[PDB]
Point group: C2
Chain length 309, copies 2
């Protein structure tokens, strides 16, 4: 009667941008000094693109205390803390970082990055050489389209720190809510998944799922059950713009229904500056609830028009 394991293979010819996890794996072999410098360089040719729209919502007071403690350190001390983070070293600061949600980690580095650009905290050593391995990883990153580039950078940041404040979640006022249109799809479960995402209405959204329903983010394991999925929505999924374009519906065994939708997604971290090409792969129960949805980062815009079996 379909498992999460079996559901995650629906629409198998959806070609994903698996260069992204490949490059992350290459990055995770580098030494910490290589990792910091590589991101800095990759940051120098897209850092002015980040926006503050994702902040003001992740609440940073306690993290900012640590940021100011770093700001008071000598450049040798600041360098060591950043290496501790990259190495996932077991230190108090690195444990604190590792406890943070993804948006707080990103805001932490975003602020430190601006402080570095203004000399307020330690820049990357002027005459420091990217190792041969690191130079090749950087070159690979520079060759990716922006949506894949920012995904690599986010995942690299989020994984730092030693692995062991709740964000304010705000549903949009009804008068401003939009309704998507999807060429070839009118199933309200799919339309309302998109619309409640876009309105941050996660309490309505989570009711579209089966009790054991699962959601699989790009290049991640499935998140299983309403509690975990809702937790993921509130922690990470605020102020996305989901812009689906088209989709197809296929019968599935046992009264299930599988739907593929392609389109574009914008993250509040970059706004309209970066449109990532995505696919949503749904498996709906006989009661038309979401038992499984996978969200794929597509290999290229050509995949937006790939709706064949």
């Amino acid at each position: 009667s379909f498992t999460v394991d079996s559901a995650r293979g629906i629409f198998p010819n959806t070609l994903t941008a698996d260069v992204v996890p490949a490059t992350i794996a290459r990055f995770n072999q580098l030494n910490a000094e290589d990792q910091l410098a590589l991101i800095w360089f990759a940051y120098l040719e897209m850092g002015k693109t980040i926006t503050v729209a994702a902040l003001g919502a992740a609440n940073m007071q306690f993290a900012e205390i640590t940021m100011n403690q770093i700001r008071q350190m000598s450049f040798q001390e600041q360098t060591q803390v950043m290496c501790d983070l990259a190495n996932r070293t077991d230190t108090p600061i690195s444990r604190a970082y590792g406890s943070w949600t993804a948006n707080i980690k990103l805001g932490f580095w975003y602020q430190l990055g601006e402080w570095m650009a203004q000399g307020i905290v330690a820049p990357i050593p002027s005459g420091y050489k990217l190792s041969a391995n690191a130079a090749s990883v950087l070159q690979a990153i520079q060759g990716l389209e922006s949506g894949q580039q920012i995904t690599v950078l986010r995942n690299c940041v989020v994984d730092m720190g030693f692995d062991t404040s709740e964000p304010v979640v705000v549903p949009r006022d009804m008068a401003q809510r939009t309704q998507v249109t999807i060429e070839g799809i009118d199933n309200p479960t799919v339309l309302n998944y998109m619309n409640n995402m876009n309105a941050n209405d996660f309490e309505v959204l989570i009711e579209l799922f089966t009790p054991d329903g699962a959601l699989q983010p790009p290049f991640q394991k499935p998140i299983v059950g309403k509690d975990a999925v809702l937790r993921f929505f509130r922690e990470e999924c605020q102020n996305l713009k989901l812009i689906p374009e088209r989709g197809v519906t296929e019968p599935a065994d046992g009264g299930y229904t599988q739907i593929k939708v392609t389109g574009k997604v914008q993250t509040p971290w970059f706004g309209a500056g970066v449109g990532m090409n995505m696919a949503w792969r749904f498996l709906l129960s006989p009661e038309n609830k979401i038992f499984f949805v996978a969200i794929d980062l597509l290999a290229s815009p050509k995949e937006l028009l790939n709706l064949v079996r």
Copy 2:
């Protein structure tokens, strides 16, 4: 024996950018809808220049709660709150805003501005007309050099709300502190004023002043006494870059000494993107303490080379 009143006229041929307070005065006559739209337009052609370097230091948790409350409002409700702020209306939100320090007010509008650019909060009405008066004020703003433009915008923002959380102040580590060089000036009181400013070392800095010493910001009244001046330093003066260039020293009556220094200042809100041309006008006591310093926004770069009586 010199008063603050008499001291503020030293070096009188220092030509200031008094177009800045003139344009602020014109702005303060406009209706609230005109004020919001005018800033938005003026913001559209310099908004991507603002940086986050001034945040993470003004601590915004409590202000951000109000920002999220605004984010939840209908566009009609959000519009009214912003008009209340511009009109300095006596409302709870506008009283809260009016109680904030300058950097918190600026961060509040900075975040709302990004949210507006992404549709998260109410944009300016598409078919709204700047009145004839407002169109002329906007044109005047657009014609100013960047340093004067950002000064107009800051003062306009700071004055909103109904007039009735402490920032983390971080002195630079000694190993990173820089020393200015000023062509024609070696008086340590002047050099160390600049150096302690640049290191956020306000407790050392304030000791350079006489007990009754006064500081006059651009187009402001003098701030009088160590307590008030130190308060101003900690609330507003973190992470400036003072880049003095040259200066002159003149004897003054009663064993006093008057010094003029010209150069450039950068604010963390824009980093190196905006260099404001400034003059510092010091009156030093016989004990070589700062009895008075005025900081002038100069009319044009030509004034950097104006050291004549």
